Amino acid sequence: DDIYKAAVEQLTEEQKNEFKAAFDIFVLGAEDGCISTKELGKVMRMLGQNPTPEELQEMIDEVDEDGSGTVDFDEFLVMMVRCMKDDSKGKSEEELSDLFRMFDKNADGYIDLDELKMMLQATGETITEDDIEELMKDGDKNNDGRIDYDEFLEFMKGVE
Amino acid sequence: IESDLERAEERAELSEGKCAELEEELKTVTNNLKSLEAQAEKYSQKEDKYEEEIKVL
Amino acid sequence: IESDLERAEERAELSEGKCAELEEELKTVTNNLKSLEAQAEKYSQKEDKYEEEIKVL
Amino acid sequence: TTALVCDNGSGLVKAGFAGDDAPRAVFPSIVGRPRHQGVMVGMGQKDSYVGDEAQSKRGILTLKYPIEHGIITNWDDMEKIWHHTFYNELRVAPEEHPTLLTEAPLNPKANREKMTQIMFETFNVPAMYVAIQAVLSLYASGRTTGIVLDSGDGVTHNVPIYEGYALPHAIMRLDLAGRDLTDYLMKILTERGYSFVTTAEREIVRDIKEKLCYVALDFENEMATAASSSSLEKSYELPDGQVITIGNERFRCPETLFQPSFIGMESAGIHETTYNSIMKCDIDIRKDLYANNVLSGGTTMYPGIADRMQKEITALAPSTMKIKIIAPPERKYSVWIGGSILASLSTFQQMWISKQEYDEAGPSIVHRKCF
Amino acid sequence: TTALVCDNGSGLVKAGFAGDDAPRAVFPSIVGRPRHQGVMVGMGQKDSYVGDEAQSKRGILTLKYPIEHGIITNWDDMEKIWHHTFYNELRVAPEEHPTLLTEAPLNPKANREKMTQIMFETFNVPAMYVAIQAVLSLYASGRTTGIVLDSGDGVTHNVPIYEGYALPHAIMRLDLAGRDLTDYLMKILTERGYSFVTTAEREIVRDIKEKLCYVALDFENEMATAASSSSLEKSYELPDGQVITIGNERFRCPETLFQPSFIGMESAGIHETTYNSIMKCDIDIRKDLYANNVLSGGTTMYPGIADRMQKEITALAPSTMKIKIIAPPERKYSVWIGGSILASLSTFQQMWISKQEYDEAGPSIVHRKCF
Amino acid sequence: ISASRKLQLKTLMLQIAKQEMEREAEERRGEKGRVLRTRCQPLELDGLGFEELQDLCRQLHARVDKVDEERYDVEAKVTKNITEIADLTQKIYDLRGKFKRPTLRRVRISADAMMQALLGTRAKES
Amino acid sequence: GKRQTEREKKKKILAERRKVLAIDHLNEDQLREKAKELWQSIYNLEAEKFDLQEKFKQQKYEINVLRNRINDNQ
Ligand SMILES: Nc1ncnc2c1ncn2[C@@H]1O[C@H](COP(=O)(O)OP(=O)(O)O)[C@@H](O)[C@H]1O
Ligand SMILES: Nc1ncnc2c1ncn2[C@@H]1O[C@H](COP(=O)(O)OP(=O)(O)O)[C@@H](O)[C@H]1O
Ligand SMILES: [Ca+2]
Ligand SMILES: [Ca+2]
Ligand SMILES: [Mg+2]
Ligand SMILES: [Mg+2]
């Protein structure tokens, strides 16, 4: 996952150009010009193995997560690193619990808007208020200003 | 839509529970009011009787 | 599922309205009960004084 | 530090820190092991659900109260209940808090001694004190005299007190209480077709009793009215549907209090054991006891009992005395409120049974000066 | 290593490695010896075609299922089916893989003991475990309560479960299933002129039943409509031409499920044995069972059954309870998906019947603690 | 906007949180050293004859016994707390498990293996 | 029973933890060495107690979190 991007980080999007050339070797002549990886994977399968389109559906759905219907090259990278994962789940969940304890300095068991706001301020991340509310609702799933350990894990699920 | 339906159901259940509790409370307090009113009427009658007794004695 | 969700939410709204009305009734009856409790205490004091005077007479 | 005012009771354990108005955690005292086999693996099934958790899974449990009539019959379960009360409902370790248990009058000594031994050895409290359940209910009323009828769920006892001097020869303890009324209601419901047998369905019958039953002002007139009209039949929805209609079972269940011959008990009702308890007192404090009759305990919450009892006592008592029945709205928690008041007093702060005293005299210290 | 989640079933053997979404190989469980003489020499004609191979040469075979009603009636054929499943459809030797068979409730003991003896002696697996076919279907739904109606092809059984505690006294096993519906359809097709007799043509009637039949929402209205209009007559092409037209046989074949008097069975339909199975449960878990009724098994795939069953139960049940019928789209493989989930659990990893344990106690180990 | 950019931002947040945790651990170890220096009375071992050394060793052994009793009591409390934590964690897991079991399918062959098989050795990244 | 049996077991364990101190056969230098050993043992006990206190605070925090999660479940 991360090793692919790390070994290609010093390079530009030409990795996707090479992937496009490889697809042209197999599925040259795309019509939509949009996100389409099911067809190329199916053509790869058609070389004699057992037909299975569920893997293709999973790969073609791993790209779109924002819900806007658009699939970026960064979304392609996310799909590539999520179909094969080695150091996922934020490494160790015990360290995640330690970080959540750092978040809950009041030790009340509920992260409020104050805790998340101060933690993001310490990070200093420049994210718009829309993304602020998105992250809040991802954490505060029931949307009542309180975030427990389970909500913290869900908010940081697949986050490392 | 299924998740939305579940949320609606739980909200309705909570509201009905609170309604039942309020009904019980109102019943109890109204019974108390009725009993106290009967006692007050009897007390007025007793007070008049006591004043009559004071006069005659 | 959509139709069921809509009906459930309407039920919840109706129950909330009923709960508000019950709250109003409860507070009103509570105030009336307190007033009558004070009245009964006055009754008790009157009876005490009348009893004492009866004994003296 | 603050004191823990626990109150074991029999049917509802009421606990909370000293100095408040209401107990912090009130939950039934039942411990129910599962009875079926269980096929799902890894579901995290425990071996005993205690307290309010076993009132939600009661469909597959066999609930059994650890306190029968005031006395404690199953010490392991009672220890489990206490452990739950301390650690999960209050979340305060007992190593740093005095405790004030409550005990019915005329109970076996061994029960009290075992209670203090448990509190000092297992939970290891700093100091504990055991108080009679009626003196506290007299504290809560703000009186200092009066004869208190504390009709709990296990046992009904009637302790007269004057000017702070309890009269030990006039305590009349009767073992009819809420549990026997539940059993009698469950037994007379069978006259319409509804059969409740399982120990879980006893809870349903208890709910029926709480929500529907009331004490009749005059028994024969109500029996005649319910047999002609149908203005009394109130319906109730079981936990699964199939509504039931209770007729003259409504006022026949709590009538057992005033006629214990219904459940075969010989003794006289709670209307006549109070008068007998008064008549055993001296001739000069009977007027004050007549005027300050106090009701407490859960079972005295039936709608219309404070009038029936007054009518009965006025019938028994001499015509000149004034009969007054104190029935505060906070009847159920009266004992615990009184316990909080007593634990909050400065004069009482040196009556606790300190641990070093127990180490020197053993568990039999409770019968000694530190009562 | 990985576990083999086999599922014998009766009609379709479903198998695959633990931890996947769908069984790897699904094929009918039929073993058919040839019946004619055979004149070509050296054609390589075998003596018994099993599995999906005998559904292509069925024109000259006599197919015979080795499992009649859950129980296994012909052990040699069942051994042949298992050998085929292990070696040719999965190509994994059983010497290096645990197995998880499935068995209907209330089956004869000897069947289960012989199954474990075969698995340990002939195929020589490391460890095997036998599980009830309904608990798995409850696993697959992701629930932990609910009453599951697993109407397979051999036998329909209805196991209620609450909070992971199965209720052994409320299992209602009924022997009407897909095979009897196939026979009844083959028997009512004769009313139009089409006669299917050979054991090979039973497969054709099964295909007709799968592709055309549906469960009517209201039976009498459909019987009246099909007798006046002709909007229901759907045609179907036999394996050789000569299309046939099915009229009101479409919804009369699967109606046998709700009225087993059609095939002469006395018992009540699957709409009333579920309600009876619920009513045998305790009074406090009936609401949860009402709300979490689960369907599984192949035969519950008829178009329109999840509405007919809900209507029937709502008619029977009290008006206040909510009746909900869970009908996942992956109904057919629900038992096997649940089996995969159960075999993939870490908590379950020590429940297997290890071979040394079998060597010490014999085949009767299965009835013991390792259930 | 970008999913990879969001993952990068989350990684940076993780880095900041880890740095704060490391700072907390350094503070904890420094406080541990300071409190250990404060509580442990220093060893005044100059100009002392045999008898006072014997008395000091005996009193130190007694104090060691006392502090050992206190530490053992705290260890028992910590063991009880961690047992309760494990019990309640399993309780929450049961209340938030069931469907949380791993639904994973091996029919999805890893894209790295597929690329290696179909391209030999000219696909080295995957 | 068990509670007083637990007390007796605890006090016996503590007595075993009390090491047999015998210095009536050692020179004053050895006495100082043994005193240093005792002080290092007390230092180890203090460090262990402090670590137990920190982990107990952590456990209290996790217990509070678990209570909040249970409240979420209700
Ligand atoms: N509102 C009520 N109406 C009638 N009976 C009640 C009511 N509340 C409680 N009870 C009865 O009182 C019992 C509880 O009594 P309680 O005072 O808790 O006993 P204890 O002295 O052991 O605490 C219950 O078992 C119930 O039968
Ligand atoms: N799509 C369908 N529509 C109607 N009936 C079906 C369908 N699929 C299977 N069946 C019936 O279900 C049976 C297969 O049931 P199955 O669940 O495989 O039984 P088992 O429990 O032995 O695996 C077949 O014999 C067929 O009669
Ligand atoms: Ca997008
Ligand atoms: Ca929240
Ligand atoms: Mg009481
Ligand atoms: Mg099946």
Side-chain angles (χ1 to χ4, degrees), chain D residues 14 133 150 335:
Chain D
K14 295 158 289 179
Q133 284 199 0
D150 180 87
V335 168

Side-chain angles (χ1 to χ4, degrees), chain D residues 9-12 14 152-153 206 209-210 297-299 301-302 332:
Chain D
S10 170
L12 278 83
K14 295 158 289 179
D153 176 32
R206 183 180 59 85
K209 169 180 70 90
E210 289 184 351
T299 328
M301 286 275 299
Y302 289 141
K332 304 194 56 178

Side-chain angles (χ1 to χ4, degrees), chain D residues 318-332:
Chain D
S319 306
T320 305
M321 301 296 104
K322 183 178 179 180
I323 309 298
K324 179 69 68 64
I325 292 193
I326 280 80
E330 331 116 355
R331 246 170 306 188
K332 304 194 56 178

Side-chain angles (χ1 to χ4, degrees), chain F residues 4 31 62 71 74 93 101 106 115:
Chain F
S4 298
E31 292 152 356
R71 170 220 45 81
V74 182
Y93 156 77
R101 298 313 158 268
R106 307 287 74 78
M115 290 177 180

Side-chain angles (χ1 to χ4, degrees), chain G residues 25-43:
Chain G
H25 42 274
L26 304 181
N27 190 16
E28 50 190 0
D29 2 324
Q30 296 79 307
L31 270 50
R32 300 177 187 92
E33 297 153 14
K34 186 57 64 61
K36 291 186 286 292
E37 301 171 32
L38 293 167
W39 190 68
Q40 180 51 46
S41 302
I42 221 178
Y43 184 132

Side-chain angles (χ1 to χ4, degrees), chain E residues 56-213:
Chain E
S56 170
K57 298 186 173 185
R58 76 184 176 218
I60 43 92
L61 303 169
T62 155
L63 320 175
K64 296 182 180 180
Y65 294 72
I67 294 194
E68 278 296 323
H69 294 151
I71 87 183
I72 307 181
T73 62
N74 190 3
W75 276 111
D76 177 60
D77 293 356
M78 187 88 272
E79 175 170 351
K80 198 181 312 301
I81 283 296
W82 275 333
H83 166 83
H84 171 85
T85 305
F86 289 162
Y87 287 79
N88 303 20
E89 289 288 349
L90 302 187
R91 309 187 190 88
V92 283
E95 300 280 4
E96 305 181 354
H97 281 285
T99 321
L100 177 69
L101 293 324
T102 62
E103 180 78 3
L106 299 191
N107 261 9
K109 316 293 275 300
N111 161 41
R112 168 182 301 181
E113 300 169 355
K114 280 285 304 179
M115 173 184 305
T116 204
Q117 163 182 327
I118 288 301
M119 292 302 294
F120 270 154
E121 287 193 359
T122 293
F123 298 89
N124 216 318
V125 293
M128 52 87 61
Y129 183 66
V130 178
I132 304 307
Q133 284 199 0
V135 179
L136 283 324
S137 59
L138 196 48
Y139 269 114
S141 297
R143 315 268 176 189
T144 179
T145 82
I147 159 184
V148 25
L149 172 119
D150 180 87
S151 172
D153 176 32
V155 56
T156 287
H157 58 263
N158 178 302
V159 173
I161 288 186
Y162 180 87
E163 216 63 35
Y165 289 105
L167 275 30
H169 64 264
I171 300 179
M172 306 290 298
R173 164 176 172 180
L174 176 56
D175 290 328
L176 207 169
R179 190 97 57 81
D180 295 20
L181 299 194
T182 294
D183 289 354
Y184 183 55
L185 172 64
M186 174 193 304
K187 176 158 189 157
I188 58 174
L189 282 194
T190 201
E191 290 174 359
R192 314 187 72 97
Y194 320 122
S195 78
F196 302 105
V197 281
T198 324
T199 175
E201 288 168 335
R202 166 115 44 84
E203 317 299 329
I204 300 178
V205 177
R206 183 180 59 85
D207 188 7
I208 293 176
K209 169 180 70 89
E210 289 184 351
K211 296 181 182 295
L212 264 55
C213 295

Side-chain angles (χ1 to χ4, degrees), chain D residues 115-236:
Chain D
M115 173 184 305
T116 204
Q117 163 183 327
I118 288 301
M119 292 302 294
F120 269 154
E121 287 193 359
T122 293
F123 298 89
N124 216 318
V125 293
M128 52 87 61
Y129 183 66
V130 178
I132 305 307
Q133 284 199 0
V135 179
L136 283 324
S137 59
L138 196 48
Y139 269 114
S141 297
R143 315 268 176 189
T144 179
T145 82
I147 159 184
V148 25
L149 171 119
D150 180 87
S151 172
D153 176 32
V155 56
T156 287
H157 57 263
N158 178 301
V159 173
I161 288 186
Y162 179 88
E163 216 63 35
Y165 289 105
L167 275 30
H169 64 264
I171 300 179
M172 306 290 299
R173 165 177 172 180
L174 176 57
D175 290 328
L176 207 169
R179 190 97 57 81
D180 296 19
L181 299 194
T182 294
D183 289 354
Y184 183 54
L185 172 64
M186 175 193 304
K187 176 158 189 157
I188 58 174
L189 282 194
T190 201
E191 290 174 358
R192 314 187 72 97
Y194 320 122
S195 77
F196 302 105
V197 281
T198 324
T199 174
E201 288 168 335
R202 166 115 44 84
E203 317 299 329
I204 300 178
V205 177
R206 183 180 59 85
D207 188 7
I208 294 176
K209 169 180 70 90
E210 289 184 351
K211 296 181 182 295
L212 264 55
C213 295
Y214 76 96
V215 170
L217 173 60
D218 189 8
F219 187 68
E220 285 300 334
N221 299 339
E222 291 288 353
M223 284 297 298
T225 289
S228 80
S229 134
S230 297
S231 56
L232 297 193
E233 294 203 1
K234 195 77 67 57
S235 68
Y236 172 88

